Amino acid sequence: MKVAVLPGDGIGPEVTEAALKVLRALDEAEGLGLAYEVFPFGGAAIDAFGEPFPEPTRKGVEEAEAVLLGSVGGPKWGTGSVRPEQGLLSLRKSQDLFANLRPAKVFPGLERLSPLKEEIARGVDVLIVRELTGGIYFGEPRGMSEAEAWNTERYSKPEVERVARVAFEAARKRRKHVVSVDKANVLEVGEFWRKTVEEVGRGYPDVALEHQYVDAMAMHLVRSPARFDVVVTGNIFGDILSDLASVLPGSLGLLPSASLGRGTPVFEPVHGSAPDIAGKGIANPTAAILSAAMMLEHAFGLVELARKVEDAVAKALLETPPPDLGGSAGTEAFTATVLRHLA
Amino acid sequence: MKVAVLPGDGIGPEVTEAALKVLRALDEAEGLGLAYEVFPFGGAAIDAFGEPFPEPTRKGVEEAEAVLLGSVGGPKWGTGSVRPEQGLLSLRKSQDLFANLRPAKVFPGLERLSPLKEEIARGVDVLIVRELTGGIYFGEPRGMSEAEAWNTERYSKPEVERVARVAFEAARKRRKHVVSVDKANVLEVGEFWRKTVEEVGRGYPDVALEHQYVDAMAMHLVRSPARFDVVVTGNIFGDILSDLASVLPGSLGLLPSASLGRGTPVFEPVHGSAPDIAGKGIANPTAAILSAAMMLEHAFGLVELARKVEDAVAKALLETPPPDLGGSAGTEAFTATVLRHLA
């Protein structure tokens, strides 16, 4: 289990270490053969090397089986050419990560934080898989003039095929149900997407496949989000649907995410670097611990342990809620109870 | 007040008449000079004339100042070339209706029907204005092959200008706040849309204008929908955002809609024809009465009376809820109390 750790800026070092404390505990208990090394990334890298993704780090992520990312960014680098964020872009490109996984889960007992009535928020555990490299965001031709502007939603068979496969594989480890979202009833691209996913699906007889229009899906995620498992769609649709789903739990700080592709996969919390809270303790490590769980599941296929970590933090959230959840548990405090439920 | 009434199929004649009872009551009380004529439309027209939008009806809507539409469709015409729905298409095209208005309002006391927690559902009263004729749905070039498929999101200055103006005019009659939604941070079309609406806005100093990304807007409509008034966006974004907003009240049957443009405006309930309920009474006329209110407001500028009708049905909903709201008030019963609060 060769893991490249990139703590990053602000609260990154603190939350990342909390994840490591959980990973080390599991390693003792199960002998996972964990081997990790921490590398400079983000603003810290700019300040120490001049660039956000220095040579030693690039080589380090390339030699690893997975990447545990902290957080990047800060007002100190809101000026200049070299921005901490280009580091994310370079990391993603260097490994050809083409799929973005964003889970939205309403942990039992925490239905009160959801914008939805508790009856409907209960049981939500959906995973949005978004195509990251193609679509209208990168399509040609594109342009603008005084009189008009245009952008192209384009997709080739291979692009749809690969993202679809990660959705199916992801589904096998969950509740084996996938819903591909398109706009097949009006757009050629939609029809193309649908028929391609229907074809790819033939090789996964153990997983159920359903199709939905993006407009209907927007309604479903608000009326009955609990009925879904894995959702796969294009770049722009995945962007919109990911954000919509992200508000379901009622606290962005609890969200982890992952980017899968041809190279080393990346796991990272969704929240920002929160530099004014750095070093005080208090930072909520939930998202980073949940990213570690995502790593165990997607990078190593250790689904059972990932679920073990998940239940652990679920209990911890009710038991010693972090400040951001109206509680007073500090970073170490919260992690301690997670560890206690991991025994 | 020359109104063309097109009752349509199923429950259309019943709900439409209920709206007429409200309009006639106001006419007596305020002397609006109401003059309406009913024409054949939809399946009834196919059965009586062979087409859903017969000559006498086309001439009738052309001579009128507004159209009150009932409902169209039914299993009897799910076969054949001539479908009741092409009638909607022809109507819309004949009058060059380029903007679709879809309100989502959570009537006080009915927060319990919303999928959202009552604290957040309370006070929702948003109007989505969607561009209907352009965008990716009709953009060129478009196509599909064995290897790829493409569709173009294209917009010319005039298209953005007209839809934007209806949003501003609509806003003046409400809370004078407009939020234009785009994808300006990634797409040329988004940037073009934004700069065009910012320019058009200069001629409406009395209305506040704000801009939002579609992905952020999806979150806002679920986390804090009560903070919006008028929302204007492109075809596809408006489609998605209209449906998302439509689930906010928790009952599609209460929703009215309107299509504005160069010709005679169309007002119609969002719900279907519900043919198995036809003639029994029981049909909820709320959406049709609210369409009549939309007519008063948008076609005749009688904002004060529209609000008067709105408050009337709001009270009626709490007082004698229709069956679809767990009550037992039939069509005539519900209308009677609406009329009583209109005095």
UniProtKB/Swiss-Prot annotation, chains A, B:
The keyword NAD applies. It catalyses: (2R,3S)-3-isopropylmalate + NAD(+) = 4-methyl-2-oxopentanoate + CO2 + NADH. Gene3D superfamilies: Isopropylmalate Dehydrogenase (3.40.718.10). Belongs to the isocitrate and isopropylmalate dehydrogenases family. LeuB type 1 subfamily. GO terms for biological process: L-leucine biosynthetic process. Its EC number is 1.1.1.85. The keyword Ion transport does not apply. Catalyzes the oxidation of 3-carboxy-2-hydroxy-4-methylpentanoate (3-isopropylmalate) to 3-carboxy-4-methyl-2-oxopentanoate. The product decarboxylates to 4-methyl-2 oxopentanoate. NAD(+) binds at residues 272-284. PANTHER family: 3-ISOPROPYLMALATE DEHYDROGENASE (PTHR42979:SF1). This is 3-isopropylmalate dehydrogenase. One of its GO terms (molecular function) is magnesium ion binding. Pathway: Amino-acid biosynthesis; L-leucine biosynthesis; L-leucine from 3-methyl-2-oxobutanoate: step 3/4. Its main location: cytoplasm. It is found in: Cytoplasm. It comes from the Bacteria. Substrate binds at residues 92, 102, 130, 215.
